[PDB]
């Protein structure tokens, strides 16, 4: 096993290469290990920021909306996340 923060770094590496699929794989694993109570400097909101965008790029529309809502719930002053939420809610008529 890699640590939570290692997996997060892997997900960020994939994302910075424009590899959204591998971003999802790593960030999903991060969330699993955070839910298991593993210690980490990375926060769930930071993971959700990468993951929500990556799942959208892969065409997973209502999941991207769900994760964007969760992101904002944990980071309400995240202006970009708020803009994303408005986009997805208008796109999917989920306003």
């Amino acid at each position: 096993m890699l640590s939570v923060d290692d997996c997060f770094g892997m997900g960020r590496s994939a994302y910075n290469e424009g590899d959204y699929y591998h971003t999802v794989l790593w960030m999903e694993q991060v969330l699993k290990q955070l839910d298991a109570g593993e210690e980490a400097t990375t926060t769930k909101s930071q993971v959700l920021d990468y993951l929500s965008y990556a799942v959208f790029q892969l065409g997973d529309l209502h999941r991207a909306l769900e994760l964007t809502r969760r992101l904002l719930s944990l980071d309400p002053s995240h202006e970009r996340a708020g803009g994303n939420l408005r986009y997805f809610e208008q796109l999917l008529e989920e306003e």
Binding site: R12, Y15, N16, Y50, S52, Y53, T68, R80, G83, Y87
Partner: peptide
């Protein structure tokens, strides 16, 4: 264009 924006890096 009209869309979301992810982390800059």
């Amino acid at each position: 264009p009209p869309g979301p924006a992810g982390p800059p890096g």
